[PDB]
Each structure stands twice: as structure tokens, then as C-alpha cells.
């Protein structure tokens, strides 16, 4: 071993890298994370960290020769997709900024990012209403397709001068613990979604896969300390695996748009769109709406 | 601490060390990422016999991430050694470990028995001129540019376990003249397509900068090597000259002698060699006559 190692073994750069509220293993060949692990709680998703102040940038800890850069993404047709989302880190502006390091980012379909994937992210945060602790591992996959001659082929686009790999699919593994002293079994689910637009017809359980199947697809072992001889419940049986429906999600998005409205006309438009979609505003929308109206009336 | 309560995901990329090679395994592709070996005059000599070895799953790899012979047999692809059997004549154990599928990628049959074998033979030849030679070999899946300018990585996966077929193979060669020599080290990096390659392209046509290969592979090779110091191009201080058609064909024909089971087959080896317009050398005729006497002395 000494003779072989005389000038060192090759370095793969796969070591776990830690940040304020997430950790990841980076793929230096694909210029994306292999996996990103985070922990979510009630208190971490509250706070005044503001995603509007964050900017994407290369992770300063990655050797530049293996980093992606914003030039790889901008104008590629793909969005910069967070694996650990900014919204899980309202409690810390530093933790949020670190999710904008490109080590946390994959090329993601714009509609998937702002649609189905966002709804899954929101469900992960919703779980903290019912579980004290939630762990999530997120990452990309490049899965095979069978072509006309029966051969199975893995095909993926690489974008930019740095050849950043565009995944065919994205995965989440969700682990939830009711409390730190409860004897209730842990709840786990694994999900794989295609990196494309997905509407409201498929329920999250349609994308659920067995943990063992995802490990075989990804070449990873998730939560290895987790005792798999003990009883672990399917998260979609003990919990809901119910994403926000069109009305709830549209109301959510419309409420968010209030805070960026720069004129009274934009506000009324937001209201009229909601009314034309036959969605009634809830008390929270009306609170934010009326406060924004008064704010805009008091500004130049 | 909470984040890590149930462990980080395992990627399984730790270096795995064997008798005369080491590797880092890719559990998703079911192939090595890199295989490092050391070659010397003495290691390529000995009585270890490749014909006794069997391909098998590496007993150290979790079965869920291992390839199996069933993935390769009948796939259209050969089981290609990264660390070759022929570098381990000194040790039957070392050779057998190169037949663990953790050392194996799906390799084009003609590439395996042709251009890649010629590169393997050149690496062994270097031990005549350098006391120590290190080699890192591995697979690559590189992109091709489509008609619209889109760059696409496409590779086949074979068998029930979806073993990844590389588009290209790489070798990094590092050579040191002696343990007491002052001259700089010799290094070369090479990338060849995983397809039939004839005798026209010289090895230097497939040479790449170390930096370029590292960018393509996501690897850093020989990290203790001080690249500040002057490291010479292996193809400048040595020849990077592969065996030509006549030399290689003679080599292959000489090998087929030892497996001849009849004077009939033994004469057809001679015929094929001559009909290739190659004349036997003294060594060929030596082994040929030894085998002729042997076969006449057997049932
Ligand atoms: Mg997103
Ligand atoms: Mg071979």
C-alpha cells in the first residue's frame, strides 16, 4: 500500500462538506451535488432572512477547476435549482446565503422548480407542524431510458463551458421524528420526480419509491445509522404526503406576490386574478393585502 | 450534531487497497472510478497464470452495488481490466484480485485485445528503463455535441445491474528512473475511445494535459507530486512508441503457440502469420519447435 501510495491516491473530492444548516457531497465531474442533507424544525423556517438579498456564486471551498459558475446557467434554458431550499433557512441569513453556493445547485426545469418541487419543499416544512425534527436528503439523478433497439441508455445534457450536468430526475428522502424522547417509530419516505413540468394531477405517492430502490439507482446509502431492523413507518401512511392543491398553492403564490407589489394597480391585479380563478382570499391574504395598500399609499 | 444524528449518506468512494492495485469504486455505475497500480521489472515476472483466474464480484463491495458476470456475458461488451493481469505475474493472489469486477469496465472487444493491450505492453516495457512506474486507469463518459449545439453525455448501461459502458478510457503514467536518480519524473496522460483503434494513430495522438484529464474526470491524480518542480513529458524522455502491426501480430501469434492442442492448429498459426506477410523470428521458431515436439510426445 505504501508503494502504491508513494505519490498519493487520486482524490475524488466526495468528502462531506458542512455549512450552517446543510451538508453535501459534491460531484466534481458533473459540477453538482450528489446529495444534500438538511434538518428542518419549526424555529428554523421562521425568521427575517430574505432570499431577495442572496446571490448565487461558486462555493469558495470548491477548487475553481471543478466549480460551476453563473455563466453556465444563465441563458441555458435551465434554472438554478436549490437542493437545500432557501425557505428552510429563514432563521439565519448566513445559512440562507450558503444555499446559494452553486455546490447546492442543479440545473432544474423552471416549472418544476417553481411548481411541483416547490410543493414538495412546502410539504417538508409542513411536517414540522407535526414532527419536532425532519431530515431531508435531496439530489439529482441521471436515469436510463430504453431506446428503440432495446439498449438502455443514460443521456443527459451538460451546459455551459464547465459542462454542468442536467439531471433527468430529482430525489428526496424524508425522515421525521415525532420527538426526541418519544418511543414512536420514525417515519420515512423516498420520492423521485422527473426534472420537467408536473401539474396537479399526480399525488406525491405516485412518485414514491422504496428506499432500497433509490439507493440502487443513486449508488448511495441514506441515513446509514438508522436501524433498519427496527420498525420504521411509511411516511405516507402515518402522515399525509398531501401536497397543496391548485387553490391552496395559487393562494400561497398570490399572497407572496403582494409583498413585492410596487403600485396599487399591481395589487388590484393580484386580487382580480385570484377572483377570476374563483379562489376566495383567506384572512391572511387580506391582512397582507390591506397593509400593502396602506404602505403604497404612504410612499412616493 | 442534530443534522448528523442518523448519518451522512454513504458514497462508498473510499480507497480500496489490494495486493498490487488500489481503486475507488463508483456504486452508481458499478465500475471503478480510478485504479492505481505500481509496476516494476520483478512484478511482471513469475508463474502466476491468467488462465486459472475467474471473474467474480469483489467480496468487499456491498452486493447491491456490485456488478456480476451475468451483466457482462452476452452484453456485446468484454470485461476489461483496468489493472491488467499481466502486471501481476509475480503473485497469483495479486492477479486474482484484478479479476474482481471492481477492477472491470465494459470494454470493446477489439479495444481490449488491441490498442489498449498495446498501451498495457508499453507500460510494462517502461520498467526496462525506469525502476518504478505508477499507472492510474479508469473509465470516462464524455459528451458529444448534437447538430443544434446541445452537448449530451450518452452511455449504455448493461445487465440487470445497469453497469455503465464508458465512452473512453484514460491512463496516467508516472515513471521514476531510480530511487537515487536526480532527473525529474516522467508523466503522461492519455484518453482513448472505447472502440476499435488500428495501428495508424500513435499514442501521442491520444495524449492530453493532466489538467484537462482532471477536468474531464473530476479527479486529482498523484496529489503528493509537486507540480512546481519540473516534471517531464513521458513522451519526450521516452518514446511513447507502441508495438506496430508486425511486432504485435508476431507477439499474438507466439502466444497462440502455447495454447495449440494439435500439430494441425500449430501449423495454422504458422500459416496465418505467413499469409499476414510476416516472417517468424527466432523466438517464435524456438517456441514453435518446442511445442511441436511436445505435441508429438502426447496422445
Ligand atoms: Mg427551488
Ligand atoms: Mg484487457
Residue numbers in the entry:
A (entry chain B): 59 to 358
B (entry chain A): 60 to 358
Provide passages from the article that reported this PDB entry.
Human mitochondrial nuclease EXOG (hEXOG) is important for mtDNA integrity. hEXOG depletion selectively increases lesions in mtDNA, but has no effect on chromosomal DNA. Human EXOG shares sequence homology with members of ββα-Me nuclease family, which contains nonspecific endonucleases. The catalytic Core domain of hEXOG is identical to EndoG, but its C-terminal extension forms a unique Wing domain that converts the enzyme from a nonspecific endonuclease into a DNA-geometry-specific exonuclease. Conversely, in mitochondrial LP-BER, the nuclease reaction occurs before DNA synthesis: hEXOG processes the 5′-end of DNA downstream of the lesion, generating an optimal substrate for DNA synthesis catalysed by Pol γ.
Apo hEXOG is a symmetrical homodimer. Each monomer contains a Core domain that is extremely similar to that of EndoG (r.m.s.d.=0.8 Å), and a helical-bundle Wing domain that corresponds to the C-terminal extension. The N terminus of each hEXOG monomer undergoes a domain-swap where the folding of the region is identical to that in EndoG, but the involved residues are from the opposing monomer rather than from the same monomer in EndoG: the residues 58KAVLEQFGFPLT70 (hydrophobic residues are bold) of one monomer collapse on a hydrophobic patch (277GLVFFPHL284) of the opposing monomer 30 Å away. The swapped domains represent 45% of the total dimer interface in hEXOG, and thus contribute substantially to dimer stability. A Mg2+ is found in each active site, forming octahedron coordination with five water molecules and Nδ of N171. In contrast to the completely solvent exposed active site of EndoG, the active site of hEXOG is an enclosed V-shaped cleft. The cleft, measuring 32–35 Å in depth and 15 Å in width, is lined with positively charged residues from both Core and Wing domains, and is both electrostatically and dimensionally capable of accommodating dsDNA at its end. Interestingly, R138 and R314 bind two sulfate molecules in the apo structure in an essentially identical manner to the phosphdiester backbone of substrate DNA, reflecting their affinity for negative charges.
